Amino acid sequence: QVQLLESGAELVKPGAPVRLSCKASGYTFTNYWMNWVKQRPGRGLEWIGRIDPSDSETHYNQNFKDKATLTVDKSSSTAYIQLSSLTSEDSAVYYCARSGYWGQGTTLTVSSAKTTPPSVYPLAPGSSMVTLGCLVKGYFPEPVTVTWNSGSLSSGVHTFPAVLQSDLYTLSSSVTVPSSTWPSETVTCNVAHPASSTKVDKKIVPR
Amino acid sequence: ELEMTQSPLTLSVTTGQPASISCKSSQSLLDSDGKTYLNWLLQRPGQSPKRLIYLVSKVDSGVPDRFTGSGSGTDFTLKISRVEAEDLGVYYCWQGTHSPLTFGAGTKLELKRADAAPTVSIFPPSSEQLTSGGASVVCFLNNFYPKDINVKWKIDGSERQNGVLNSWTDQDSKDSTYSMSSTLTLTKDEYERHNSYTCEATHKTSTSPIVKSFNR
């Protein structure tokens, strides 16, 4: 079916440019306008502009004028937005969207700091029904994504919003499962940090 | 630029009871073409937005039959026959009649349910983490209702509040409860110089703190 593949995150420094993409598939690329919308964390939605891929007719919201430039490449069915001389005011999630369908969004962080991959720590009990967890500590920038047993374990899962301490992000996730099924059967934490292109798996071993 | 106003900000409802969100525009949304380009949208926590309604009243296919939309000119409402846990999220109205497109600020939807006490779990530092010179003691307070809660930490019976970081979830998409994380961070040296670590919760389901703990 229809989908709009965006990249997960991008870190860049102040003053620098950046180019965000939105690969489309499942439909005729040229038959639907592509929108771009900006959402700041905790905050609300702001419309940036839109582009007709057939002939590249382009509208902008005037608030994003000169800041934002739209293009496409028919050859690859991809839509682009080009942002010039960045600032922390531009740090946000950037969604591409078409009639009826929104992309997953790219988290853009504008900061002079280094990409810092997370350290991942298992949370097992010290000793019916058991709670395990994962501590994802010391990363930058947002976001991280957590799954359990590559998505097979999704029931009774709680993943918490990240906290920011000393310019680094921390978060954790809990999973509750039958004592029957652990440690009898494997349980594993899966953590993605797309800004550093990092993946980490942690097997929860008993303590 | 055209201005969208949603009310209420937060809507709280008994299961099975019906829900209504009101959307107001600073200017009529009837386009010159006879169509009214008013849309509704849903964003569940951590999720990408999902179309609910377009053209005031036309319901996205893929969206359950309890959602309806109506209104005209500057006044519009979204109705839900009876609310379920899967409806919880933030509801935006947005307009495509006049450029630039503008959005309402959002209405957060909430469900009432029976009181539930937190399942509390405590976890000492990871061995891996200790090696590298840090120590984090973790506490989960899961599947409780109502929202209102708070956590106290104790090392060897004395309260500790420096180095504590908490995080909360929004209502659960199946059971309508809330869950919370609390994390206490120390140096390895400090951690090792004490024995008794206690995590304890204050909630209306209990007259006393609900306590979990461990010793080294």
Domain harbouring B38, CATH code? 2.60.40.10
B129 — contact with chain A (CB < 8 Å)?
yes
Dihedral sign for Cα atoms in the order A93, B8, B39, A56: negative
Which residues of chain A make contact with B48, given a CB cutoff of 8 A? Answer: 95, 102-105
CATH code for residues A113-206: 2.60.40.10
Same domain, B4 and B14: yes
Closest Cα in chain A to B170: A160
Q: Which of A47, A62, A135 sits opposite B138 (nearest CB)?
A: A135
* Best residue of A129, A134, A174 to probe chain B, by most B CBs closer than 10 Å: A174
- For chain A, the residues before each gap (C–N > 2.5 Å) are 127
Option in A104, A119, A174 nearest B48 (CB): A104
Q: Among B77, B97, B113, which residue terminates a domain?
A: B113
- Sequence-ordered strand ranges (E) for B58-177: 58-59, 67-72, 75-80, 89-95, 102-103, 107-112, 119-123, 134-144, 150-155, 158-160, 164-168
> What are the tokens at A38?
């900006």
Instruction: For chain A, list residues whose CB is within 8 angstroms of any CB belonging to chain B.
Output: 35, 44-47, 59, 61-63, 95, 97, 100-105, 119, 121-126, 131, 133, 135, 137, 158-163, 165, 170-172, 174, 176, 207
B74 and B135 both lie in a single domain: no
Q: Nearest CB to A126: which of B106, B138, B214?
A: B214
Q: Give the residue extent of every domain in chain A.
A: 1-112, 113-206
H or E stretch covering B73: none
Q: Given the structure tokens 């809507």, which residue do they identify?
A: B11
Tell how strand A58-60 and strand A106-110 pair up. Answer: unpaired
B208 and B188 in a common domain:
yes
Boundaries of domain holding B44: 1-113
A83-115 burial: b if 16+ Cβ within 10 Å, else e = beebeeebbbbbbbbbeebbbbbbbbbbbeeeb
* Answer CATH for A1-112 from 3.40.50.10470, 3.60.20.30, 2.60.40.10, 2.40.50.140: 2.60.40.10
Tell me the torsion sign for CA atoms A34, A2, A142, B87. Answer: positive
Residues B120, B83 within the same domain: no
Same domain, B98 and B18: yes
Q: Which of B72, B89, B113 represents a domain boundary (last residue)?
A: B113
Judgement on whether residues B98 and B166 belong to the same structural domain of the protein: no
Question: Cβ separation of B92 and A125 shorter than 8 Å?
Answer: no
State the nearest Cα–Cα gap between A30 and chain B, in angstroms.
20
Judgement on whether residues B19 and B101 belong to the same structural domain of the protein: yes
Cβ within 8 Å of residue A83, ≥6 positions away: A17, A18, A19, A20, A67, A68, A69, A90, A108
Q: Does B195 contact chain A (CB < 8 Å)?
A: no
Pairwise CA distance, residues B8 & B5, whole Å: 9
B96, B165: one domain: no
CB atoms within 10 A of CB B216: 11
B140 with A158: CB under 8 angstroms?
Answer: yes
B37 shares contact with chain A (CB less than 8 Å): no
Q: Is B134 helix (H, G, I), strand (E, B) or coil?
A: strand
Collapsing DSSP states into helix, strand and coil, what is residue B201?
Answer: strand
Q: Is B50 left (phi over 0), alpha (psi -120 to 50) or beta?
A: beta
Task: Kindly state whether residues B4 and B103 are assigned to the same domain.
Answer: yes
Residues B107 and B150 reside in one and the same domain: no
Yes or no: say if A47 and B101 are a contact pair by the CB < 8 Å rule: yes
* Claim to verify: residue B16 and residue B98 sit in the same structural domain: yes
Q: Quote the CA–CA distance of B12 and A85 in Å, as a whole number.
A: 43
SS3 string of A123-192?
A: ECCCCCEEEEEEEEEEEECCCCEEEEHHHCECCCEEECCCEEECCEEEEEEEEEEEHHHCCCCCCEEEEE
Token pair belonging to B195? 């024995």
Yes or no: say if A147 and A126 are a contact pair by the CB < 8 Å rule.
Answer: no
Residue B214: Cβ within 10 Å count: 15
Whole-number Å distance between alpha carbons of A116 and A138: 7
Last residue of a domain, one of B92, B113, B134: B113
Please tell me the number of Cα atoms within 13 Å of A56 on its side-chain side: 11
Query: Which technique was used to obtain these atomic coordinates?
Result: X-ray
Q: Do B167 and A95 touch (CB under 8 A)?
A: no
Our count of domains for chain B comes to 2
Distance, CA of B166 to CA of B169 (rounded, Å): 11
Q: How many CB atoms lie within 10 A of CB A155?
A: 10
Regarding whether B163 and B106 lie in a shared domain, the answer is no
